Amino acid sequence: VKQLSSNFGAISSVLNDILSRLDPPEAEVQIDRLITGRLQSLQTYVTQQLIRAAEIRASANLAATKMSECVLGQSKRVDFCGKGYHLMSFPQSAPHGVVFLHVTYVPAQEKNFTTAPAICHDGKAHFPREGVFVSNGTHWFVTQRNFYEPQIITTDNTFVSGNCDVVIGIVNNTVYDPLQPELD
Amino acid sequence: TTEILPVSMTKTSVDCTMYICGDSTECSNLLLQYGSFCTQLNRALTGIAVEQDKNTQEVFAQVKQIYKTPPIKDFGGFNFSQILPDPSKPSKRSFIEDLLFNKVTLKQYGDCLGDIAARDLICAQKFNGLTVLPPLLTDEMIAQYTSALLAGTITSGWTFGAGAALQIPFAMQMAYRFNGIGVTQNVLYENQKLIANQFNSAIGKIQDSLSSALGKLQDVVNQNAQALNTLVKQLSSNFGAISSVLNDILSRLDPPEAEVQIDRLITGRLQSLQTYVTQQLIRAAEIRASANLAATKMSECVLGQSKRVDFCGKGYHLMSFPQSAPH
Amino acid sequence: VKQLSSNFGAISSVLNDILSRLDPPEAEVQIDRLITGRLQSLQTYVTQ
Amino acid sequence: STQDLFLPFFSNVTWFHAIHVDNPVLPFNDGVYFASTEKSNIIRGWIFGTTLDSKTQSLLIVNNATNVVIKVCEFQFCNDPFLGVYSSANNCTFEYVFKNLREFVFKNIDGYFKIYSKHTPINLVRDLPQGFSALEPLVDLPIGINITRFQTLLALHGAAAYYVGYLQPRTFLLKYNENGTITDAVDCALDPLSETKCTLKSFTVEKGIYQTSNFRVQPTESIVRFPNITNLCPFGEVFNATRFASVYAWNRKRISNCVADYSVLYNSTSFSTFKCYGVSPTKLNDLCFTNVYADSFVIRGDEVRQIAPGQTGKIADYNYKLPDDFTGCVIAWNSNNLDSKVGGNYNYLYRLFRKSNLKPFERDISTEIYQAGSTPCNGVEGFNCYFPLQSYGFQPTNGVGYQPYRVVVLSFELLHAPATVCGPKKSTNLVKNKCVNFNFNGLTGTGVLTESNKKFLPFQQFGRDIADTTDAVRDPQTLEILDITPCSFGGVSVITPGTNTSNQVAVLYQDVNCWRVYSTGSNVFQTRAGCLIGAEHVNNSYECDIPIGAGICASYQTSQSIIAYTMSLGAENSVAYSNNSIAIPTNFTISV
Numbered sequence A: 001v002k003q004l005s006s007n008f009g010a011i012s013s014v015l016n017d018i019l020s021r022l023d024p025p026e027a028e029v030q031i032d033r034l035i036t037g038r039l040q041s042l043q044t045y046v047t048q049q050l051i052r053a054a055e056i057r058a059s060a061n062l063a064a065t066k067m068s069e070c071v072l073g074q075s076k077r078v079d080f081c082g083k084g085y086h087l088m089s090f091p092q093s094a095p096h097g098v099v100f101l102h103v104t105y106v107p108a109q110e111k112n113f114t115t116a117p118a119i120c121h122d123g124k125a126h127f128p129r130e131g132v133f134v135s136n137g138t139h140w141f142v143t144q145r146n147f148y149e150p151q152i153i154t155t156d157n158t159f160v161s162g163n164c165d166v167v168i169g170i171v172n173n174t175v176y177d178p179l180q181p182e183l184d
Numbered sequence B: 001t002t003e004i005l006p007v008s009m010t011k012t013s014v015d016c017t018m019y020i021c022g023d024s025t026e027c028s029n030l031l032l033q034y035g036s037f038c039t040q041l042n043r044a045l046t047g048i049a050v051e052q053d054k055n056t057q058e059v060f061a062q063v064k065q066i067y068k069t070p071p072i073k074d075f076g077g078f079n080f081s082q083i084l085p086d087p088s089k090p091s092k093r094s095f096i097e098d099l100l101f102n103k104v105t106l107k108q109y110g111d112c113l114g115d116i117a118a119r120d121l122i123c124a125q126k127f128n129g130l131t132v133l134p135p136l137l138t139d140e141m142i143a144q145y146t147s148a149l150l151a152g153t154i155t156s157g158w159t160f161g162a163g164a165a166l167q168i169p170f171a172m173q174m175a176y177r178f179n180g181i182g183v184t185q186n187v188l189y190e191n192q193k194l195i196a197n198q199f200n201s202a203i204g205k206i207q208d209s210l211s212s213a214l215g216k217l218q219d220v221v222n223q224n225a226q227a228l229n230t231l232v233k234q235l236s237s238n239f240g241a242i243s244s245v246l247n248d249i250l251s252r253l254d255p256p257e258a259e260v261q262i263d264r265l266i267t268g269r270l271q272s273l274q275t276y277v278t279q280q281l282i283r284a285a286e287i288r289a290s291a292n293l294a295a296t297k298m299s300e301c302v303l304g305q306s307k308r309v310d311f312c313g314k315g316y317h318l319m320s321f322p323q324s325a326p327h
Numbered sequence C: 001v002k003q004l005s006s007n008f009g010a011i012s013s014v015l016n017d018i019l020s021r022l023d024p025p026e027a028e029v030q031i032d033r034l035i036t037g038r039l040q041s042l043q044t045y046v047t048q
Numbered sequence D: 001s002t003q004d005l006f007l008p009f010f011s012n013v014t015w016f017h018a019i020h021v022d023n024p025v026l027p028f029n030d031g032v033y034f035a036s037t038e039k040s041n042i043i044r045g046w047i048f049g050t051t052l053d054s055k056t057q058s059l060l061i062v063n064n065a066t067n068v069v070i071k072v073c074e075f076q077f078c079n080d081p082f083l084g085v086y087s088s089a090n091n092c093t094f095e096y097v098f099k100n101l102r103e104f105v106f107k108n109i110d111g112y113f114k115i116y117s118k119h120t121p122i123n124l125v126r127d128l129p130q131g132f133s134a135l136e137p138l139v140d141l142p143i144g145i146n147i148t149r150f151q152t153l154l155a156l157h158g159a160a161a162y163y164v165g166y167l168q169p170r171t172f173l174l175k176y177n178e179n180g181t182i183t184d185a186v187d188c189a190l191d192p193l194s195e196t197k198c199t200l201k202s203f204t205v206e207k208g209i210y211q212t213s214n215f216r217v218q219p220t221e222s223i224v225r226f227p228n229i230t231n232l233c234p235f236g237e238v239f240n241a242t243r244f245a246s247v248y249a250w251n252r253k254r255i256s257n258c259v260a261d262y263s264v265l266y267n268s269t270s271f272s273t274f275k276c277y278g279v280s281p282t283k284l285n286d287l288c289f290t291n292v293y294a295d296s297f298v299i300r301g302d303e304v305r306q307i308a309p310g311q312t313g314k315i316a317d318y319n320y321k322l323p324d325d326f327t328g329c330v331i332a333w334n335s336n337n338l339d340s341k342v343g344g345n346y347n348y349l350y351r352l353f354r355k356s357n358l359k360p361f362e363r364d365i366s367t368e369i370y371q372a373g374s375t376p377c378n379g380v381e382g383f384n385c386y387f388p389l390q391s392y393g394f395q396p397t398n399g400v401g402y403q404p405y406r407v408v409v410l411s412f413e414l415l416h417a418p419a420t421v422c423g424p425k426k427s428t429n430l431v432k433n434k435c436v437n438f439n440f441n442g443l444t445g446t447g448v449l450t451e452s453n454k455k456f457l458p459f460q461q462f463g464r465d466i467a468d469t470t471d472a473v474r475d476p477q478t479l480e481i482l483d484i485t486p487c488s489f490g491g492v493s494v495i496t497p498g499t500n501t502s503n504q505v506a507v508l509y510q511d512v513n514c515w516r517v518y519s520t521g522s523n524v525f526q527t528r529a530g531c532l533i534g535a536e537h538v539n540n541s542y543e544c545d546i547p548i549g550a551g552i553c554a555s556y557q558t559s560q561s562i563i564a565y566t567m568s569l570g571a572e573n574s575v576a577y578s579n580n581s582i583a584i585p586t587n588f589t590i591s592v
């Protein structure tokens, strides 16, 4: 709207001022200058609208992917659905857009333990099935990686592979084997 | 294996009157009728310029804890000395970053006075209103960010990307990652020396292949330079006027007859500036898509272990390490 | 192809019609109008 | 926004008193702002003029006890005029018959003397007051004189004080309220802050960093360098020759090494036709001319319109042809007294017949019996076999169309090669290493001149770069090569905490190593982004508030001031790594 006051090299930017005081053959050249200038303005507007629409289109594709993978499922890709281990998401509509509420899980209070890769019982090497071996200082337990829940090392809890001569930091401890008491 | 990504481009600004009129007062009085267009062009350019800093922030500044690598380098036989910062060079850059920075080749008024002008291309640009603005983060700050990311990954695995960094021995982390591709831990623990030797040899191959590659990063520099030099060359067009030189027209012609020629030149030079700004916008959109991809890779390959095929290399992904490169 | 019939403020859109009936000094201004218009058309095509 | 002659904001005005317990003659440069603080009607009027001594014309604007009198005459003004002015007033062309702030603005443009004014109630004792009030048009007098000086007319027996300021061409941003009155303005060239206000087209600026404009230097001197020429051009054997040539065998004469001062023809020669191609007649006095030639002939009066580019007719087809691209002038005058004889003057001739049209600047003198049809002539001249040339019968009693006219065509080149004609203009000294307006052989520009190592071949005068602008020149006096450099270079930025918060700003000069600065002040600090002026540097490291660049940021802190620092990247914490040590979380957090 503001660019309508440009002369573009004509006597005035107002058509009615040119049409009075000038006859058609001399008014035509001035009108032609104004026409060229105003077509250029419209062209610039349309080009910048196209570039902006492309950016909004990329944003909307991202929003559709988030709706599919965070709201309609649980996502394992890191930082796609918030900070932390993603639990669930809820959408809310906003004017011209969307807001996502990401509920995630955050590990809170950490404690230090000494750890070991394997346990050497009887010339055998025992490895955790799905946990880690830790020590409170005097005793040895197996736990899960993301929450502390200590447990006694049993044979239904580890698995054997090879002897104790190859693993770098193996330690000596006993494995319960929870069948011997029952057989007796 | 290595993957190269562009993240940012050169920031530019234009003095519209300096380009169109030079030091001619009459041309400036004539150009006062087109001020809205120069303001509009500069708005578009400033949008591009702030977007570049936003791109760099999104790729490199994810974590705000600047971790330090431990003095004791006991990582189970893995040797990361080639990607950790050298504490003796002025720039605290790793060996590989120093090699990479030497493979891409990127001013006072008294410095170029007389002959030096119009010979040196930068001064020819600067005498016509075309300036290049410096980025917000220096190379040293980006190197600091990358070293923090590296120290986090090799001392705490993937825990520092979800909260506080929890330390774990490096071999036990490697065993965890073997669990994540479907291989039991004992394979790693039994074959640990072989695995460490293979990793060290592969890093050596990367190093020896770089000192001998970065076309994706050189073409961005070349494109920006070529556009600015094309703008400088387009000042010799008549656009249907008697000459392309304002001073030649202003002598030999009186104001009423000089105005029509000056008007032709003004229209032509505004069109040139407009074309430059449009192509800069399209290029900035492409660089923005590339930087979004780089941020996603940093999140999913460096701060975690990815199970999507071919996103983080060829084969079953184990881990990734970032290095900064110019742009 | 269709945009070749625009005058762009010239007497005609056909070069051969202008070149007959007009001498070089007066034909130059009309030809200049046509040249500016057709360069603008090519530019718009390349941008889109 | 409007560009016009205004009084700049915060200027330095002169102050004059009439205190018992001043009416000097002042300059009138480009228009005057006149303010008057009164309570007793002491200031009564003005006189405007050049010499004010009856040799020239002067303007009197006086308020006598009863009337307002405006006169334009030749006055013998008194040395000390007052009320309780002049002696003579001979040739008059135009005639017409502290509690107060009487503001006037006086302008003199294109023969019109323009007056704006406004009156305001005040209550003060001294010093011109604060505030804003726009003056309205009062009168526009068609006097048509050359005002250069002026003098105030006071009255005698009282307390009065008057202030004088001078107008300059400026761009202002004026504000109109909903009633149509100007209530505020911004001077767009006072400050960089004002420049960002002008660009954003608002009176309010938000916090940030803005690019303003490249650093500009205005020229101090003007220089002219023309060759050493002493002789005057031969206007007397070109325009005052006793015999002219016939149009078919037209004459061409070389002209060189002479000053082209044509004002000597003002009394000499009245021209019915004088038209110039490729140059404006008002620039002839400031130019130097290359390859000058003069063509002379005599034609009939009706045929003069044919001596022009792109013409038809027998003169323009068989006798004399001009190029389509012609630079030069055509001059024609009636010569009935010289070239008409009572019996009939048959000395002058033309070509009536030619197989084909002539090329530009081609002469044909061939007298070959023209064959009209078939049946060759064998040069015998009969039916369809005509003598090619024909003669003009010039008699004193011809109609104006049939009378003789003398025609001179001047052909030359401009601003490309060394020249030797060079119209009347006095040369100055050559000054170097300063931005100066310059004129070299008619080519005008602005810039800084330096000694050059370039060696020109003898046939060249100017040197041009890739953008086609002239960057080297041979001096026409000392024959030494000089380089030309622009004097506007370097980027500028302004840092503001917001106009709402403060008016204090900082300025960054991107191409200065700390002087091409607007003001030095204090707190000059050097960064890789440039020289920063107006900010205090601290040794802390905060988060980035306003980005300056190259790692440097700025803020407005606590007394309040702008501080510049190096941005911090975050907290530093080292991980407690060992080869047999793990850390397990014991509780969790649920975060949205």
Ligand SMILES: *[C@@H]1O[C@H](CO)[C@@H](O[C@@H]2O[C@H](CO)[C@@H](O)[C@H](O)[C@H]2NC(C)=O)[C@H](O)[C@H]1NC(C)=O
Pocket (backbone or CB within 6 Å): A136, A137, A138, A139
């Ligand atoms: C490590 O854990 C062991 C096993 O729980 C702890 O030993 C127990 O201590 C409690 C408290 O005195 C006794 O009631 C249990 O009977 C003990 N169990 C066994 C098997 O001895 C031990 O105190 C912990 N060590 C440290 C340093 O905290």
Ligand SMILES: *[C@@H]1O[C@H](CO)[C@@H](O[C@@H]2O[C@H](CO)[C@@H](O)[C@H](O)[C@H]2NC(C)=O)[C@H](O)[C@H]1NC(C)=O
Pocket (backbone or CB within 6 Å): A120, A172
């Ligand atoms: C774990 O137990 C094994 C055997 O049960 C220990 O290996 C023996 O250690 C003794 C004393 O250190 C040596 O004299 C033997 O030669 C070792 N090998 C055998 C008996 O085959 C091993 O040292 C223990 N690890 C410890 C205590 O950290």
Ligand SMILES: *[C@@H]1O[C@H](CO)[C@@H](O[C@@H]2O[C@H](CO)[C@@H](O)[C@H](O)[C@H]2NC(C)=O)[C@H](O)[C@H]1NC(C)=O
Pocket (backbone or CB within 6 Å): B079, B081, B082
């Ligand atoms: C880790 O790798 C570095 C570099 O590959 C090793 O340092 C090199 O060691 C050799 C001797 O084997 C020297 O000749 C080189 O000059 C060393 N280069 C540098 C840059 O120091 C290093 O020995 C490897 N192992 C450890 C434990 O650091």
Ligand SMILES: *[C@@H]1O[C@H](CO)[C@@H](O[C@@H]2O[C@H](CO)[C@@H](O)[C@H](O)[C@H]2NC(C)=O)[C@H](O)[C@H]1NC(C)=O
Pocket (backbone or CB within 6 Å): D064, D065, D066, D067, D069, D097
């Ligand atoms: C102020 O000036 C005016 C005009 O110069 C004077 O009016 C003229 O006075 C003379 C003398 O009586 C008359 O002959 C003219 O006809 C008057 N012109 C008019 C009225 O237009 C006036 O007298 C002056 N006032 C004083 C106080 O001197």
Ligand SMILES: *[C@@H]1O[C@H](CO)[C@@H](O[C@@H]2O[C@H](CO)[C@@H](O)[C@H](O)[C@H]2NC(C)=O)[C@H](O)[C@H]1NC(C)=O
Pocket (backbone or CB within 6 Å): D090, D091
């Ligand atoms: C300017 O005033 C002078 C002086 O009166 C005028 O010159 C005289 O005018 C009278 C009036 O006709 C003549 O009789 C004299 O011969 C003139 N010359 C002299 C020397 O007295 C002159 O005409 C006035 N100019 C204008 C433009 O009005």
Ligand SMILES: *[C@@H]1O[C@H](CO)[C@@H](O[C@@H]2O[C@H](CO)[C@@H](O)[C@H](O)[C@H]2NC(C)=O)[C@H](O)[C@H]1NC(C)=O
Pocket (backbone or CB within 6 Å): D355, D356, D357, D358, D359
């Ligand atoms: C210049 O001279 C040439 C040769 O005399 C002219 O060309 C000839 O023109 C005649 C007709 O006028 C033809 O019959 C010949 O065949 C032409 N010969 C050649 C070699 O072109 C030419 O017309 C002359 N140009 C002018 C402007 O007079």
Ligand SMILES: *[C@@H]1O[C@H](CO)[C@@H](O[C@@H]2O[C@H](CO)[C@@H](O)[C@H](O)[C@H]2NC(C)=O)[C@H](O)[C@H]1NC(C)=O
Pocket (backbone or CB within 6 Å): D587, D588, D589
């Ligand atoms: C685990 O964390 C929660 C909070 O995140 C603890 O619950 C808080 O306990 C304190 C006192 O122990 C109360 O004052 C708060 O009101 C509790 N908050 C809530 C939301 O109930 C909980 O005690 C922690 N558990 C352990 C074992 O540390």
Ligand SMILES: *[C@@H]1O[C@H](CO)[C@@H](O)[C@H](O)[C@H]1NC(C)=O
Pocket (backbone or CB within 6 Å): A110, A111, A112, D576
């Ligand atoms: C774990 O041990 C390290 C070693 O000193 C210590 O710095 C750190 O604070 C400990 N962590 C906890 C949670 O106690």
Ligand SMILES: *[C@@H]1O[C@H](CO)[C@@H](O)[C@H](O)[C@H]1NC(C)=O
Pocket (backbone or CB within 6 Å): A168, A169, A170, D579, D580
């Ligand atoms: C851990 O380091 C100690 C020396 O500090 C070493 O004796 C021990 O064998 C190492 N353990 C492993 C598993 O490498």
Ligand SMILES: *[C@@H]1O[C@H](CO)[C@@H](O)[C@H](O)[C@H]1NC(C)=O
Pocket (backbone or CB within 6 Å): D177, D178, D179
């Ligand atoms: C505008 O005009 C109205 C009506 O006369 C008046 O009340 C008001 O004070 C004027 N000024 C402004 C700033 O509105």
Ligand SMILES: *[C@@H]1O[C@H](CO)[C@@H](O)[C@H](O)[C@H]1NC(C)=O
Pocket (backbone or CB within 6 Å): D267
């Ligand atoms: C102008 O020319 C006329 C006629 O020759 C002569 O009388 C007059 O004095 C000249 N004027 C001057 C002084 O140039």
Ligand SMILES: *[C@@H]1O[C@H](CO)[C@@H](O)[C@H](O)[C@H]1NC(C)=O
Pocket (backbone or CB within 6 Å): D236, D240, D268, D269
């Ligand atoms: C032209 O020459 C005649 C010849 O005597 C002379 O009378 C006349 O004044 C001259 N005109 C000039 C030189 O302008």
Ligand SMILES: *[C@@H]1O[C@H](CO)[C@@H](O)[C@H](O)[C@H]1NC(C)=O
Pocket (backbone or CB within 6 Å): D228, D476, D477, D478, D479
């Ligand atoms: C012109 O004048 C200058 C200074 O007066 C002198 O040095 C020079 O020799 C003269 N001649 C030429 C041809 O420049």
Ligand SMILES: *[C@@H]1O[C@H](CO)[C@@H](O)[C@H](O)[C@H]1NC(C)=O
Pocket (backbone or CB within 6 Å): D513, D514, D527, D528
């Ligand atoms: C400014 O010049 C000084 C003195 O030569 C130099 O040490 C410094 O490198 C320059 N500053 C910058 C930012 O280059």
Ligand SMILES: *[C@@H]1O[C@H](CO)[C@@H](O)[C@H](O)[C@H]1NC(C)=O
Pocket (backbone or CB within 6 Å): D538, D539
């Ligand atoms: C900042 O540090 C430098 C060097 O460490 C010192 O010279 C300067 O005085 C310090 N500035 C302040 C304000 O303490």
